[PDB]
Coordinates of C-alpha atoms in Angstrom, one line a residue:
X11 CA 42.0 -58.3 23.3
X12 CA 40.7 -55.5 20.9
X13 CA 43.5 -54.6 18.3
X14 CA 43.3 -51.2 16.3
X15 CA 42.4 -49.0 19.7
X16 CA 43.8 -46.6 17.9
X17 CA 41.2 -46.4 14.8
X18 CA 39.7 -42.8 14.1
X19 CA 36.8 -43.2 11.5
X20 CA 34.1 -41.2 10.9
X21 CA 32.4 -39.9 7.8
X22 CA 34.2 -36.8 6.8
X23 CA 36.9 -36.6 8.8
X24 CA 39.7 -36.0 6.1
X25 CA 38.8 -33.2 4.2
X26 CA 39.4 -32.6 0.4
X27 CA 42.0 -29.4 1.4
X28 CA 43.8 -32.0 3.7
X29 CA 44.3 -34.5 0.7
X30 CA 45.5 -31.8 -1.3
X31 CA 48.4 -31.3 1.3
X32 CA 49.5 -34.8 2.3
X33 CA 52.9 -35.4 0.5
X34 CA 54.4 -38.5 2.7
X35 CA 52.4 -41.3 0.4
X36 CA 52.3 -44.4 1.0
X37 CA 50.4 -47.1 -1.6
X38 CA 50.2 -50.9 -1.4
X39 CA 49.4 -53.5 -3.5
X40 CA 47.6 -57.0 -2.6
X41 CA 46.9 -59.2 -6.1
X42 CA 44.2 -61.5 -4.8
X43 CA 44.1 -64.9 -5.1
X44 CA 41.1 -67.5 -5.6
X45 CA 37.9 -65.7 -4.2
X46 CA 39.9 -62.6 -2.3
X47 CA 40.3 -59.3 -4.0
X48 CA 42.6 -57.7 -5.4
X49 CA 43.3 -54.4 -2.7
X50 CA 45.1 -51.3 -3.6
X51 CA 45.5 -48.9 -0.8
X52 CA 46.9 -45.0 -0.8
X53 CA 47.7 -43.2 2.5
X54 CA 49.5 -40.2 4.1
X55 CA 51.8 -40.7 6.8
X56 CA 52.5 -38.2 9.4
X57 CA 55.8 -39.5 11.3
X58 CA 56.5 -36.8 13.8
X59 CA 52.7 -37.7 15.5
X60 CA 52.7 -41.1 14.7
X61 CA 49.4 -41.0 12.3
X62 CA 48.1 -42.3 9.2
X63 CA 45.4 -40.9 7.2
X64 CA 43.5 -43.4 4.1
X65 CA 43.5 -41.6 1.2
X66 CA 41.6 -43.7 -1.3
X67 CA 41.6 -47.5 -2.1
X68 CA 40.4 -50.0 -4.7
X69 CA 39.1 -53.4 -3.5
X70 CA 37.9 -55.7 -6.7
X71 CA 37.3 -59.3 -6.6
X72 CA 37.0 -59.5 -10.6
X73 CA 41.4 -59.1 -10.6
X74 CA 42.1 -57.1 -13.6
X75 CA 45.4 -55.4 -14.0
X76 CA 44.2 -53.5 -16.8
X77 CA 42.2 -51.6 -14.3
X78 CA 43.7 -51.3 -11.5
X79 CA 46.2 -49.5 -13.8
X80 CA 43.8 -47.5 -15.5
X81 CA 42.8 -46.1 -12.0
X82 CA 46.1 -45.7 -11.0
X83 CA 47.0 -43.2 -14.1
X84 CA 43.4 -42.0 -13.5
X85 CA 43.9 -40.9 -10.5
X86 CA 47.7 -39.6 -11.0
X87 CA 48.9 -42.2 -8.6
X88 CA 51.2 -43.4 -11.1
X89 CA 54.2 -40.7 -9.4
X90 CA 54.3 -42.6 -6.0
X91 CA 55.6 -45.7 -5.5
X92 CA 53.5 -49.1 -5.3
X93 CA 55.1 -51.5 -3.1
X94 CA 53.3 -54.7 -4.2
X95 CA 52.1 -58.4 -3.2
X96 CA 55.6 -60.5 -4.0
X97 CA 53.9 -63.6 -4.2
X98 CA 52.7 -62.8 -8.0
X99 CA 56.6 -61.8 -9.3
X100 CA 54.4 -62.0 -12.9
X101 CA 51.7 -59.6 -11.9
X102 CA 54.6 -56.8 -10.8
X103 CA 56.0 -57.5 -14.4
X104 CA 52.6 -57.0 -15.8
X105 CA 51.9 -53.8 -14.5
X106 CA 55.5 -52.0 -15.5
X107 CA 55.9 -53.7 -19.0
X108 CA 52.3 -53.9 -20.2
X109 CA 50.6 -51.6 -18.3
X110 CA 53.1 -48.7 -17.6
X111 CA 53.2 -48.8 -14.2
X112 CA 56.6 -48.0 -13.4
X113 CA 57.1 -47.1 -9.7
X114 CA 55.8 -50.7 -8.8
X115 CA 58.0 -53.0 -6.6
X116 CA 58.2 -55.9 -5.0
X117 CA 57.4 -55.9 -0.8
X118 CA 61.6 -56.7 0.3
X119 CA 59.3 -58.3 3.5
X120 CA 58.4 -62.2 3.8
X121 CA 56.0 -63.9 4.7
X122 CA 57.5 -63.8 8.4
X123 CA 57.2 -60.2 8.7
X124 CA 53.0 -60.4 8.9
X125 CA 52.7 -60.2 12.8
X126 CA 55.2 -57.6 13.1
X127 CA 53.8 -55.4 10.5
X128 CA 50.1 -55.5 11.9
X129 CA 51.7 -55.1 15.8
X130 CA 53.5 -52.0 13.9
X131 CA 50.0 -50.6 12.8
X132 CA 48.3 -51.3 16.1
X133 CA 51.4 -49.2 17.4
X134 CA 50.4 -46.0 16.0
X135 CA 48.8 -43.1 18.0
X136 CA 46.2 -42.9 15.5
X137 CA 44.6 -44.2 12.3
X138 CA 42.4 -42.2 10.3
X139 CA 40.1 -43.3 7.9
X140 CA 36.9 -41.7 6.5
X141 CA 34.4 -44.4 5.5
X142 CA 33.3 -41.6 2.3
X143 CA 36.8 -42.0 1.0
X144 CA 38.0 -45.7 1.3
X145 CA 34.7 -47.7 2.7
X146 CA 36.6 -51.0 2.6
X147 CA 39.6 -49.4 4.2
X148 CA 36.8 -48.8 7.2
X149 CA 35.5 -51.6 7.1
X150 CA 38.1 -54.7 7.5
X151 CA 39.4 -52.5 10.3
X152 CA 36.7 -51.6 12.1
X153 CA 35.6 -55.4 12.3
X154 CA 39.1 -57.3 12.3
X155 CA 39.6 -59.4 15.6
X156 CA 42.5 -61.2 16.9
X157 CA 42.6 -65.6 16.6
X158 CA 42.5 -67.5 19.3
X159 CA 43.8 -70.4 20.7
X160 CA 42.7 -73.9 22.2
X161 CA 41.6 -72.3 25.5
X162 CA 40.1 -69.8 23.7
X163 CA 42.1 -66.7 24.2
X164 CA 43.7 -63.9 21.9
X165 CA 46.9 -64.0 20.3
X166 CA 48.8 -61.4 18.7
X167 CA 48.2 -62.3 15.7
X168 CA 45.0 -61.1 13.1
X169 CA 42.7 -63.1 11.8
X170 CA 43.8 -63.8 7.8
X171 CA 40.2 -63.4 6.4
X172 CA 38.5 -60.0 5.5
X173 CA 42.0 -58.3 5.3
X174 CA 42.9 -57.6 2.2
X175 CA 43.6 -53.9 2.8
X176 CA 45.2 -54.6 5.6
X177 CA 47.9 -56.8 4.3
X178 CA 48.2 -53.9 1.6
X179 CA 48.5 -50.9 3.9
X180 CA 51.2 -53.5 5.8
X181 CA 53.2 -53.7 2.3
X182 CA 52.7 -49.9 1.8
X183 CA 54.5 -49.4 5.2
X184 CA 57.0 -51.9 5.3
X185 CA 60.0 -49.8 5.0
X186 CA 59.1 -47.6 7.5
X187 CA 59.0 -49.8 10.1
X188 CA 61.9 -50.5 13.2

């Protein structure tokens, strides 16, 4: 009925010592297309207790590559690897040939893997997100819902609207998944 039980989100509850020890990064990369954003997500996994912790995020609905790459090389996130939106093969080029993004990559993933991915997030013991950090992140969520059917009722699948992090924390964590 009520997906993401597992959310745990509250203003600073990652703390700047914390980020400087996560080392099990995990970023993704949603392009946008017509009104929705462009959505790149960074996060920390913690395997052995079945956690994830947002790290930082940028949402922009004005898509330019030029500055989501600038942020990235800002930022130093240039060292971990992107796994990115395969749906824009171009944008991927882009970013490594023009922009020096080099650790980007394709998601492997199809478009049949979106149920399973979002079931494999809902799966986790906890989810950890500090609204100071990535608002966004927080927010899409905190507020995402389940469709429905005919008669009404949830299925297990999320709504595809107000997601756009979602489906890029999904790419960021494909290959972890089984």
């Amino acid at each position: 009925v009520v997906p993401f039980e597992n959310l745990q989100i509250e203003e600073g509850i990652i703390t700047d010592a914390e980020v400087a020890r996560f080392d099990n990064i995990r970023q993704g990369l949603d392009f946008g297309y017509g009104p929705d954003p462009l959505a790149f997500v960074r996060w920390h996994y913690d395997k052995r207790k079945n956690r994830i912790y947002a790290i930082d995020e940028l949402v922009d609905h004005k898509v330019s590559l030029k500055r989501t790459a600038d942020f990235v090389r800002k930022n130093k996130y240039e060292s971990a690897r992107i796994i990115a939106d395969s749906s824009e093969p171009r944008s991927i080029d882009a970013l490594k040939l023009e922009h020096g993004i080099n650790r980007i990559e394709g998601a492997k993933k199809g478009p049949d893997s979106v149920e399973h991915g979002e079931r494999w997030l809902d799966e986790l013991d906890a989810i950890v997100i500090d609204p100071l950090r990535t608002p966004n992140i927080a927010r899409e969520f905190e507020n995402i819902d389940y469709q429905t059917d005919k008669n009404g009722d949830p299925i297990p699948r999320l709504e595809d609207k107000d997601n756009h992090t979602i489906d890029a924390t999904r790419y960021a964590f494909e290959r972890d998944m089984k």
